[PDB]
Amino acid sequence: YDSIFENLNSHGQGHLLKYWPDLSEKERAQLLNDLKKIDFAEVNELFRRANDTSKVIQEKVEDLKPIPDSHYEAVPNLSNEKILEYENIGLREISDGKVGVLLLAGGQATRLGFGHPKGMYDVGLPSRKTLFQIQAERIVRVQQMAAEKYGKEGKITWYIMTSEHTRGPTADYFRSHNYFGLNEEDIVYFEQGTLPCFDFEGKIFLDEKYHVSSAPDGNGGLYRALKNQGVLDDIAKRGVEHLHAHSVDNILIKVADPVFIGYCKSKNADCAAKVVQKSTPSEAVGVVCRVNGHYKVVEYSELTDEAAESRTADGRLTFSAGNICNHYFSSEFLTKICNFESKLKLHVAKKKIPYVDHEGVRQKPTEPNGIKMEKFIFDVFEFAENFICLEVARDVEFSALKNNDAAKKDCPSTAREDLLRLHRKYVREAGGIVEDNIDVEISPLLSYGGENLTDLVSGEVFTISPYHLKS
Numbered sequence: 001y002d003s004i005f006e007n008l009n010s011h012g013q014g015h016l017l018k019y020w021p022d023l024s025e026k027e028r029a030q031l032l033n034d035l036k037k038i039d040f041a042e043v044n045e046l047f048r049r050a051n052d053t054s055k056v057i058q059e060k061v062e063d064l065k066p067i068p069d070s071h072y073e074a075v076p077n078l079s080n081e082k083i084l085e086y087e088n089i090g091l092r093e094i095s096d097g098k099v100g101v102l103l104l105a106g107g108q109a110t111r112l113g114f115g116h117p118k119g120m121y122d123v124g125l126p127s128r129k130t131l132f133q134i135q136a137e138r139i140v141r142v143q144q145m146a147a148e149k150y151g152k153e154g155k156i157t158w159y160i161m162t163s164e165h166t167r168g169p170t171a172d173y174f175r176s177h178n179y180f181g182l183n184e185e186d187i188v189y190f191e192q193g194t195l196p197c198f199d200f201e202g203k204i205f206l207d208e209k210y211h212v213s214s215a216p217d218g219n220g221g222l223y224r225a226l227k228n229q230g231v232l233d234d235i236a237k238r239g240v241e242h243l244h245a246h247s248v249d250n251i252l253i254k255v256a257d258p259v260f261i262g263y264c265k266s267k268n269a270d271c272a273a274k275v276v277q278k279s280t281p282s283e284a285v286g287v288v289c290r291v292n293g294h295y296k297v298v299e300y301s302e303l304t305d306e307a308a309e310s311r312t313a314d315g316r317l318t319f320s321a322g323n324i325c326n327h328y329f330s331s332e333f334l335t336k337i338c339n340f341e342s343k344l345k346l347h348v349a350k351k352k353i354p355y356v357d358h359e360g361v362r363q364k365p366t367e368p369n370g371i372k373m374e375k376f377i378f379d380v381f382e383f384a385e386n387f388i389c390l391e392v393a394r395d396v397e398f399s400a401l402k403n404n405d406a407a408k409k410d411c412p413s414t415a416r417e418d419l420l421r422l423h424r425k426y427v428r429e430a431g432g433i434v435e436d437n438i439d440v441e442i443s444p445l446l447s448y449g450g451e452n453l454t455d456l457v458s459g460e461v462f463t464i465s466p467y468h469l470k471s
């Protein structure tokens with residue numbers, strides 16, 4: 001106790017042991033287990049840098065400039081012959097077993113009110129498939145496409161990053177469903193770290209008398225987790241050369257998109273980000289920018305209202321390159337990143353954090369009472385030697401699940417609506433006849449991105465809703 005107290009008090013966190021006399025021996029052991037999981041020197045060192053307001057005000061007066069339209073291309077503007085070239089390059093890499101996916105599934109947002117990892121959400125499709133199952137079947141299908149073209153049945157290694165409260169339920173969900181037709185050996189779970197939650201005076205919250213308040217350390221915690229969980233070793237052993245990192249909530253996600261992988265390989269990019277066009281200033285998307293001669297993403301929470309609402313001569317937003325958390329990393333760049341993730345800025349967010357008050361009572365604040373600190377995955381972009389930005393069509397590739405339906409944006413209903421609208425488009429683009437009032441869902445096992453539909457829908461008329469086109 002004495003050595004533990006000193007470690008705490010030398011860093012001003014001695015209050016965490018306040019309730020020691022009232023705790024059972026098991027609660028005492030739980031509390032001590034919480035404390036030994038925290039490096040109080042590194043945490044306290046990190047908090048000071050993250051909350052150095054003088055440096056923050058300097059970053060606010062930076063001459064923030066958007067990525068010029070001249071520095072990126074848009075997939076829908078490419079010729080179909082250039083698209084095929086990129087797709088075939090990506091399909092070859094997938095077939096050769098050189099592609100992995102880094103699924104960011106440790107996020108703990110509560111906005112949705114879902115008592116499970118977000119990946120288990122069912123937005124009410126005719127198939128009633130979850131985000132996890134849809135993504136798994138997209139992996140199945142694109143592996144099949146790659147093997148059918150190039151012979152070898154290469155596998156995408158699915159690296160699923162979890163946090164403490166998602167690790168168990170996520171592994172249980174995939175196991176219960178027989179990995180949705182994928183092989184268990186190719187799905188690799190790894191767990192990101194956490195950081196404690198602080199009040200406005202820099203003292204760490206107690207979630208219970210025997211439990212320190214903590215939260216996942218941001219999706220920028222990927223890099224440290226990759227190293228200390230042995231994932232970089234696994235990547236090197238498997239011969240994986242390309243990594244597709246993306247969020248869990250985008251129901252339109254082109255997992256291991258061969259066009260994306262082929263595009264970045266052909267441009268010899270060490271790192272890349274997909275973007276969509278931002279048309280409302282308040283959309284909660286980061287924007288790709290240039291400052292001091294390198295690329296950056298400024299999170300929606302850190303973009304001034306002035307910059308967000310600034311307009312071009314056209315009337316487009318000046319900052320219109322909307323990040324959709326959909327990134328490419330070369331294996332070489334990834335392993336070099338993980339050796340300097342220490343320098344990665346910690347971002348501060350005001351949050352409503354439950355806490356034990358000065359009277360042993362757990363409160364639930366109605367106004368933000370504390371701070372969480374997060375590393376952001378895109379903060380490595382400024383260290384890339386050949387960063388590439390690739391614009392994609394929003395209706396084909398981005399529809400985020402963030403809020404409940406009452407918010408009416410980025411909700412289950414818009415996610416389900418965006419996917420069904422896209423599949424209606426795929427059916428029409430393959431020669432099928434279907435009106436907007438018909439809900440036709442295309443199984444990912446039948447079509448990854450609109451291919452493989454002519455023989456089934458060309459000339460056919462779809463008049464009954466809902467309809468499920470299956471494999």
Ligand SMILES: CC(=O)N[C@H]1[C@@H](OP(=O)(O)OP(=O)(O)OC[C@H]2O[C@@H](n3ccc(=O)[nH]c3=O)[C@H](O)[C@@H]2O)O[C@H](CO)[C@@H](O)[C@@H]1O
Nearest residue numbers: 104105106107216217218219247248285286323324325376
């Ligand atoms: C990548 C990032 O910093 N912000 C992006 C993110 O913000 P946004 O704030 O919407 O999302 P979060 O950064 O909270 O989470 C993004 C993804 O990372 C996962 N996650 C998050 C935190 C964590 O500790 N562990 C973890 O695995 C989430 O579960 C999800 O898979 O998505 C938007 C698009 O939808 C982009 O416009 C934002 O620029």
Ligand SMILES: [Mg+2]
Nearest residue numbers: 325326377378
């Ligand atoms: Mg991102």
